[PDB]
Design an enzyme around this catalytic site. Sequence first.
Site, PDB file in Angstrom:
ATOM      1  CB  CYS A 145      -0.975  -0.002   1.190  1.00  0.00           C
ATOM      2  SG  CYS A 145      -1.988  -1.499   1.393  1.00  0.00           S
ATOM      3  CG  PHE A 182      -7.498  -6.178   1.123  1.00  0.00           C
ATOM      4  CD1 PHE A 182      -7.206  -5.034   1.870  1.00  0.00           C
ATOM      5  CD2 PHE A 182      -6.857  -7.365   1.447  1.00  0.00           C
ATOM      6  CE1 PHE A 182      -6.286  -5.075   2.920  1.00  0.00           C
ATOM      7  CE2 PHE A 182      -5.931  -7.410   2.491  1.00  0.00           C
ATOM      8  CZ  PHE A 182      -5.652  -6.273   3.237  1.00  0.00           C
ATOM      9  CG  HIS A 191      -3.066   3.529   1.816  1.00  0.00           C
ATOM     10  ND1 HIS A 191      -3.456   3.160   0.545  1.00  0.00           N
ATOM     11  CD2 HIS A 191      -3.322   2.460   2.609  1.00  0.00           C
ATOM     12  CE1 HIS A 191      -3.879   1.910   0.559  1.00  0.00           C
ATOM     13  NE2 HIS A 191      -3.814   1.464   1.801  1.00  0.00           N
ATOM     14  CG  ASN A 239      -6.686  -0.792   1.474  1.00  0.00           C
ATOM     15  OD1 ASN A 239      -5.924  -0.359   0.606  1.00  0.00           O
ATOM     16  ND2 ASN A 239      -6.245  -1.406   2.563  1.00  0.00           N
TER      17      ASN A 239
HETATM   18  C1  LIG Z   1     -10.960  -3.755  10.755  1.00  0.00           C
HETATM   19  C2  LIG Z   1     -11.787  -2.470  10.954  1.00  0.00           C
HETATM   20  C3  LIG Z   1     -12.387  -2.051   9.635  1.00  0.00           C
HETATM   21  C4  LIG Z   1     -12.947  -2.797  11.939  1.00  0.00           C
HETATM   22  O1  LIG Z   1     -13.739  -1.612  12.094  1.00  0.00           O
HETATM   23  P1  LIG Z   1     -13.755  -0.837  13.593  1.00  0.00           P
HETATM   24  O2  LIG Z   1     -14.030   0.659  13.441  1.00  0.00           O
HETATM   25  O3  LIG Z   1     -12.407  -1.036  14.297  1.00  0.00           O
HETATM   26  O4  LIG Z   1     -15.016  -1.552  14.519  1.00  0.00           O
HETATM   27  P2  LIG Z   1     -14.878  -2.919  15.531  1.00  0.00           P
HETATM   28  O5  LIG Z   1     -13.824  -2.677  16.601  1.00  0.00           O
HETATM   29  O6  LIG Z   1     -16.245  -3.161  16.107  1.00  0.00           O
HETATM   30  O7  LIG Z   1     -14.466  -4.244  14.620  1.00  0.00           O
HETATM   31  C5  LIG Z   1     -15.522  -5.014  14.056  1.00  0.00           C
HETATM   32  C6  LIG Z   1     -15.023  -6.453  13.913  1.00  0.00           C
HETATM   33  O8  LIG Z   1     -13.865  -6.440  13.311  1.00  0.00           O
HETATM   34  C7  LIG Z   1     -12.767  -7.203  14.303  1.00  0.00           C
HETATM   35  N1  LIG Z   1     -11.452  -6.756  13.943  1.00  0.00           N
HETATM   36  C8  LIG Z   1     -11.036  -5.468  13.926  1.00  0.00           C
HETATM   37  N2  LIG Z   1      -9.733  -5.442  13.509  1.00  0.00           N
HETATM   38  C9  LIG Z   1      -9.350  -6.717  13.250  1.00  0.00           C
HETATM   39  C10 LIG Z   1      -8.153  -7.263  12.802  1.00  0.00           C
HETATM   40  N3  LIG Z   1      -6.818  -6.672  12.416  1.00  0.00           N
HETATM   41  N4  LIG Z   1      -8.042  -8.584  12.637  1.00  0.00           N
HETATM   42  C11 LIG Z   1      -9.116  -9.400  12.901  1.00  0.00           C
HETATM   43  N5  LIG Z   1     -10.291  -8.869  13.337  1.00  0.00           N
HETATM   44  C12 LIG Z   1     -10.411  -7.531  13.511  1.00  0.00           C
HETATM   45  C13 LIG Z   1     -13.204  -6.927  15.534  1.00  0.00           C
HETATM   46  O9  LIG Z   1     -12.735  -7.871  16.547  1.00  0.00           O
HETATM   47  C14 LIG Z   1     -14.753  -7.062  15.355  1.00  0.00           C
HETATM   48  O10 LIG Z   1     -15.196  -8.338  15.392  1.00  0.00           O
HETATM   49  P3  LIG Z   1     -16.131  -8.809  16.708  1.00  0.00           P
HETATM   50  O11 LIG Z   1     -17.270  -7.826  16.906  1.00  0.00           O
HETATM   51  O12 LIG Z   1     -16.710 -10.187  16.491  1.00  0.00           O
HETATM   52  O13 LIG Z   1     -15.203  -8.787  17.899  1.00  0.00           O
HETATM   53  C15 LIG Z   1     -10.944  -1.343  11.556  1.00  0.00           C
HETATM   54  O14 LIG Z   1     -10.444  -1.705  12.817  1.00  0.00           O
HETATM   55  C16 LIG Z   1      -9.755  -0.921  10.686  1.00  0.00           C
HETATM   56  O15 LIG Z   1      -9.794   0.061  10.034  1.00  0.00           O
HETATM   57  N6  LIG Z   1      -8.529  -1.741  10.690  1.00  0.00           N
HETATM   58  C17 LIG Z   1      -7.394  -1.287   9.833  1.00  0.00           C
HETATM   59  C18 LIG Z   1      -7.014  -2.408   8.835  1.00  0.00           C
HETATM   60  C19 LIG Z   1      -5.557  -2.153   8.499  1.00  0.00           C
HETATM   61  O16 LIG Z   1      -4.693  -2.546   9.245  1.00  0.00           O
HETATM   62  N7  LIG Z   1      -5.227  -1.397   7.273  1.00  0.00           N
HETATM   63  C20 LIG Z   1      -3.831  -1.116   6.910  1.00  0.00           C
HETATM   64  C21 LIG Z   1      -3.129  -2.476   6.468  1.00  0.00           C
HETATM   65  S1  LIG Z   1      -3.534  -2.919   4.745  1.00  0.00           S
END
Ligand SMILES: CC(C)(COP(=O)(O)OP(=O)(O)OC[C@H]1O[C@@H](n2cnc3c(N)ncnc32)[C@H](O)[C@@H]1OP(=O)(O)O)[C@@H](O)C(=O)NCCC(=O)NCCS
Lengths: 353, 375
Positions: free
Chosen positions: A149, A201, A267, A300
């Site tokens: 990314c 993704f 990003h 993304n």
């Molecule tokens: C994943 C994401 C979209 C979830 O939305 P959020 O605003 O955090 O809302 P929540 O905390 O309620 O998460 C919802 C679900 O996603 C899970 N989750 C969040 N992040 C996770 C991760 N890295 N891996 C696995 N599960 C994940 C949570 O546990 C939850 O599941 P559950 O309700 O059964 O426990 C958010 O955390 C995010 O933007 N992550 C960034 C992804 C990333 O790293 N991008 C850059 C690398 S390419």
Amino acid sequence: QAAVLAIATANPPNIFYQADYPDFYFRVTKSEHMTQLKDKFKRMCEKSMIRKRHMYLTEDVIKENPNIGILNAPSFNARQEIMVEEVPKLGKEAALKAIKEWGQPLSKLTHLIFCTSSGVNMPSADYHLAKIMGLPPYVQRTMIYQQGCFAGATALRLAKDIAENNGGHTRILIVCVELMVVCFQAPSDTYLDLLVGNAIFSDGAAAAIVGADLDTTTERPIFNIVSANQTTIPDSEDGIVGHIREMGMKYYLSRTVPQVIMFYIVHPGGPAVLRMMEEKLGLSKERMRASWHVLSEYGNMWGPSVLFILDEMRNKSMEEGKSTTGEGLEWGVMFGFGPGLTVETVVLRSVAI
Amino acid sequence: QAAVLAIATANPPNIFYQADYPDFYFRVTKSEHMTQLKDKFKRMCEKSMIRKRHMYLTEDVIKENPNIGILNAPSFNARQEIMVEEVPKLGKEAALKAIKEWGQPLSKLTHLIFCTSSGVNMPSADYHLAKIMGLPPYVQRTMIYQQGCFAGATALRLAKDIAENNGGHTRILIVCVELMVVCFQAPSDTYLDLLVGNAIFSDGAAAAIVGADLDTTTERPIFNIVSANQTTIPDSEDGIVGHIREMGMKYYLSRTVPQVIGNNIVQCCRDTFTPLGINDWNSMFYIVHPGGPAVLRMMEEKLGLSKERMRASWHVLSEYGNMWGPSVLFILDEMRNKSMEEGKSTTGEGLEWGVMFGFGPGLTVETVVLRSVAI
Ligand SMILES: CC(C)(COP(=O)(O)OP(=O)(O)OC[C@H]1O[C@@H](n2cnc3c(N)ncnc32)[C@H](O)[C@@H]1OP(=O)(O)O)[C@@H](O)C(=O)NCCC(=O)NCCS
Ligand SMILES: CC(C)(COP(=O)(O)OP(=O)(O)OC[C@H]1O[C@@H](n2cnc3c(N)ncnc32)[C@H](O)[C@@H]1OP(=O)(O)O)[C@@H](O)C(=O)NCCC(=O)NCCS
């Protein structure tokens, strides 16, 4: 000083609205019995802040390549055969649109920088694009494979020095493309770090033209590339991990990445990323709008996403009668990030509208 | 103007003499019953002008990963796991020696360009090398994957613009590594353009430091990078083809590649160095990627070169084989080492101007115009 002279984008024509994607994904992967995991996936998609995504991998493509939808089944050959052809082809669509805006023939180009993490071949995606586009044989190619990314931002860092060290006739075409054919995996409740990628993704292509010492009668800059630097975050190697295997790519996402990782281009790695930037700098809601918009409408897309946001920012700036291509502001910054953890920082200057 | 400030190399420790390799290769792939094909491979090796090769992939390594020696068996995971770890490790050995010649601390590095066609990962081999060398986190990385045998020349082209556009403090470490774990394939009588690669492909690492505006006090240039241009030969797509698959990489070599490449780089030579005023073709020095013997003979025959002009390129072919990306840097090192040892007046064999040709899939040519430094 190097400048972005044109920007344009492309996406696969098949639209997946996020409200429908949990049903589609668990059906095409034949995993509807996994009712608890689907509940978790529904919440991931609902919290993603993504409205739709454009994807190459349809149900028919899975039906044609069934091992892509069977977890751990050998499918690397099948994914590779798709991507070696289709990644350059989508890049050509965005590239020709960028060149049309630029207004010059391909014969005026000196360089190509192609970036993808979706498939590898020899000769590479840069060569294939040059073949199908008819880039003249003097066009000098740089292939940026597997940089995830931050690839879009790293192309601008490289293009700045190429444009400025070679002079006024140097013109760089940048093409960034991803197709999640590369890493689509069926669900498993012991691999949640793969399942989050299925929620966020997506596929897309973006192209830009960079040059320095502009012919003012024919070219018009959109942004100037003031400076560009890459940094690595210590002790974060496990934040974003891609393992290319016989089952395709396993792209592992850690829960801590957002916590670790002027106009703004950020990003859109996910919503947590864009929120992390907002409250940390007291940014107005206006500042992240363009980055939030591309997340909503495209998801993304790894490499090309920062160019989608760049294009969206200057378009809205023009449509809304703003003072500059950077929303009426003078200075700006673009952040790419990805495996490492690696941050690419590109300092930008807008142009008067 | 950008200059090469240090060059160093490394290879896997295990040496395979070419006289013994047909026996080894058909034995460890349990293919001795293919008697006619083994005779054909003997003739390939006997014609290769390769005396020895250093290889990571020993009989023990194949025994540990037996699908690598079973044609069409799935072995990409096994190959990947080896190379993701071992490619950066061999690169570190070469890089440490280049920095020691350079003489400045790692903290003075601003950039790293890593080149390989041997394995892919995220983070990539550039990050992994930085981590295991403990490079400071401000070293800016570029990863050049899958560019085959023109990768070492393309790293110089990139490093020139980085070093010259950013100025006096910019110092670029270049590391090129290959391990034929990536594409070793057992023999088949219907894939002969696969068997060629087993006769000539080998393993190695090379590192260089590049910078402009030198501290005269502490840094000495070996060669100046005067200009560098990539070109593509039309209608030659199928000449060199690498298909990365579940059995590893299948690296296919078309019969006409040496002649297509050789004729093209002769033309590039005439096109490039006539306006520079080089009076005759023995008045400049040459580095030509050792793709095989035939491309080196073409340079000699078409330009009428004396025997000393391709000597450094012949030597790396003989002692190391075709190591893809790093080979042109081996030859650069060898040339300037022998120039010093033999009492020549410059690092380019007593001559002022010289050319480096890398080439590979495309077909693609990287031409680097070099100027030597007085000794
Ligand atoms: C994943 C994401 C979209 C979830 O939305 P959020 O605003 O955090 O809302 P929540 O905390 O309620 O998460 C919802 C679900 O996603 C899970 N989750 C969040 N992040 C996770 C991760 N890295 N891996 C696995 N599960 C994940 C949570 O546990 C939850 O599941 P559950 O309700 O059964 O426990 C958010 O955390 C995010 O933007 N992550 C960034 C992804 C990333 O790293 N991008 C850059 C690398 S390419
Ligand atoms: C392996 C090699 C040293 C053999 O030496 P040579 O100069 O071709 O000598 P010969 O012409 O007698 O060839 C010997 C055998 O190799 C076969 N052969 C050579 N190149 C071949 C190719 N690309 N594909 C299939 N067979 C080939 C010949 O058909 C011949 O078979 P035979 O003895 O049973 O009749 C030489 O072919 C070579 O270096 N090839 C690689 C060159 C190249 O493509 N470089 C670019 C990669 S970076």
